[PDB]
Amino acid sequence: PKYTIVDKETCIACGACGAAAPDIYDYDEDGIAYVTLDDNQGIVEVPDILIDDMMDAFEGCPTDSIKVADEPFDGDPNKFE
Numbered sequence: 678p679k680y681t682i683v684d685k686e687t688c689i690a691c692g693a694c695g696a697a698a699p700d701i702y703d704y705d706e707d708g709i710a711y712v713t714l715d716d717n718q719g720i721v722e723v724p725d726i727l728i729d730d731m732m733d734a735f736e737g738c739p740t741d742s743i744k745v746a747d748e749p750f751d752g753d754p755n756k757f758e
């Protein structure tokens with residue numbers, strides 16, 4: 678499986694990820710991205726049909742703020758660092 682999460686501490690509010698993967702990422706009132714699948718907790722497996730969009734958003738993010746992993750993040754975007 679795949680899980681994804683935004684590191685809100687590094688996001689620069691550029692609007693690219695919601696364009697790449699609108700069913701996965703949206704934004705708070707200040708434009709900081711978050712994963713809508715699971716309220717940015719990194720615990721809901723990304724649907725198979727959405728993985729390619731997820732990878733577009735992940736690869737495109739200018740500040741490497743989107744994380745992807747094969748195990749849940751359990752709330753911590755920096756778990757695998």
Ligand code: SF4
Binds near residue numbers: 683702708737742
């Ligand atoms: S693409 Fe990256 S920097 Fe831009 S809004 Fe999404 S998470 Fe933030």
